[PDB]
Symmetry: C3
Subunit: 148 residues, 3 copies
């Protein structure tokens, strides 16, 4: 199997795939919040679910959308960076640590966001998860530059 191409790759693919599933969960939650609070973005949805007055914003829906958007701002770059990084032959334990800190930080971020935890808990989880991304980005820069 091509998951054996590099020692860090299986750990990367496990953590990345879990985070994609975590984003799908946020999408599902968002939909459930829309249905339960009757707050739809489109008139066609609202008219199916009670009438035109349910085409409206809602603070819990907006919060879900922000959590999902922040995921797209951070998890998507990790998908790219962590994949490339997996092929630069980093120490396997060190790679594991980058991926684990990102995974735990991002899961905690979503819990802190949707659970409305006090500041600066969410902000800290964001920063902690960004550290391994910044680290991987720099390492890729050096490897790319030196092969020019």
């Amino acid at each position: 199997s091509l998951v054996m191409s590099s020692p860090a790759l299986p750990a990367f693919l496990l953590c990345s795939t879990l985070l994609v599933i975590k984003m799908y969960v946020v999408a599902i939650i968002t939909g459930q919040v829309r249905l339960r609070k009757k707050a739809f973005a489109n008139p066609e949805d609202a008219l199916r679910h009670g009438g035109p007055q349910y085409c409206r914003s809602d603070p819990d829906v907006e919060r879900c959308l922000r959590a999902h958007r922040n995921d797209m701002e951070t998890i998507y770059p990790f998908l790219f960076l962590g994949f490339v990084y997996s092929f630069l032959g980093p120490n396997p334990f060190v790679a594991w640590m980058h991926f684990l800190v990102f995974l735990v930080g991002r899961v905690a971020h979503t819990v802190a966001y949707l659970g409305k935890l006090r500041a600066p808990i969410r902000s800290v989880t964001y920063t902690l998860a960004q550290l391994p991304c910044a680290s991987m980005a720099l390492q890729i820069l050096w490897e790319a530059a030196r092969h020019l």
Copy 2:
């Protein structure tokens, strides 16, 4: 050519690339709607195209933006998942089916969204396209976990 690295890869790259082009089309449509309805997000744009009163929101522009955002929530994870999945040696016909259901589901989603089709047509196309993504995600999880 490295498109021969796995039997499912050419089908994946065809479907993914078509969907990226489909997102570019949504961007172009969004711009056309802004120009035609004179609804710009920035004062600098509005002042070039008729005056400061054209810095305003518009429901058709907002609809285009939602379609584009939903694309980013679903097509981007597919780009990652479908690529990795292509290298796990799935049955070629089964892989084709995952990619085709995603492609047709997503194209139909954009048509349903921008064409303002009645509920739950859009919601159904979303769910149908998510099925192959969920399937690929699970398969990747198993392959990654077993190589740890």
Copy 3:
């Protein structure tokens, strides 16, 4: 090192990684603008930083968010397209030109957006950066189709 898998790959990884770092910079700027203008998206953030009245929108914050979102609409597809394209054996100089035009166009786009430059400067930088993406997309389509 696997950065030697194709002659265009190091140039791609340099430009892509710089653009990911450029998006992180936009995130950091956005946070600084929120703190300095006291415009927070969440009540929990606002209550930590002066009171509930600082849970409010702000035009500079909204501008930062639009710049970041436009990045996600354009840089993320480039991450996918430029990676695949790097493996299709394009002329190395021609590949360099695609990646450089995208890099310069996107950096200029963010400068034009956040610096509030007059129209159509931002719009031109967007279009110029989309050209190499469109070109790569087409080339991938042809390579994928011909291997079906």
